[PDB]
Symmetry: C3
Subunit: 130 residues, 3 copies
């Protein structure tokens, strides 16, 4: 489905915070005893509405809520951390949970370079037939 922003307004810029994902700490700053307190672990960035991604994302978060709330209602876990890992598992099961029938629409196996390897081998025995 496409995402249709249907909110009263949209802030087209996203000034975000998160935790660092790349690069090493400086010196001993990685040691809990020496490093930042809880308030000082955040990085910041700014994203603009290229391709309408920001207004689309605001709408996406809004539309996700019902399914997410129903999921939380049905779980007995007090705090849920496993949603993305389960999505990754389901991604793999969708493609590799059954036998991969080559050339089928649900088998992500490309023998294109494998054809060029065998279609070039036709002249290996049919051309070399002295």
């Amino acid at each position: 489905e496409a995402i249709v922003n249907a909110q009263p307004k949209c802030n087209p810029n996203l000034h975000y915070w998160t935790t660092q994902d790349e690069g090493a700490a400086i010196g001993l700053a990685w040691i809990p005893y020496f490093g930042p307190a809880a308030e000082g672990i955040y990085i910041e960035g700014l994203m603009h509405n290229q391709d309408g991604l920001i207004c689309g994302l605001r709408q996406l978060a809004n539309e996700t809520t019902q399914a997410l709330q129903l999921f939380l209602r049905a779980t007995t876990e007090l705090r849920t951390f496993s949603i993305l890992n389960r999505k990754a598992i389901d991604f793999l099961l969708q493609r590799w949970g059954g036998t991969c029938h080559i050339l089928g629409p649900d088998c992500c196996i490309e023998p294109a370079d494998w054809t060029k390897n065998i279609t070039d081998k036709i002249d290996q025995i049919i051309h070399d037939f002295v």
Copy 2:
């Protein structure tokens, strides 16, 4: 292994309860503030002993207990939610954790339609050899 029910008795019908997995909520019922309390989130169904699945399942649950208890004894997690996700991961690793040697007994890759694609291409160069 096959499942041999060895219990004193078997209730051949399973009147079960669980949480809903399909279909949307009605109106605002998905909102925690408005929706059912803890006691009202359950659906019910009834299953009969077709193929002996119910008596088999009672025996299966009984026989699972030792391995499950030994697993719980060895974990330090207070509440364990990850068993099924780990089974899914192990399902994928069993089939895709190594190189898939096509035509081997442990490689779930079907080139049957791939043969028909190349065995039909024999007359592409051997029949068209004017």
Copy 3:
């Protein structure tokens, strides 16, 4: 990267403890009510420095700490149990997260026995051409 032990010393033998992974319990010992208390669930073993694995492992644990501490700083989970399962997921995604182009360096599909199946089928139509 290779592992260079750069510690002041290395105990080349590893006298370890862990929990049992194989074989069934004896009699009723798997029942929590009857089985060992928390202190009695451990097995022990001894490993020597063949292939330098023990001194390498001491260095590996030391070198892992920075990345592990930075990971723990950034998580909101109070107790983290999911690291190995996430590694397994990432192992599968690295190999099977995209289309597998046969004969490419990132596609773990071996058609070697598949070649022998088709290269032996060359004389199925070219040799049998009466």
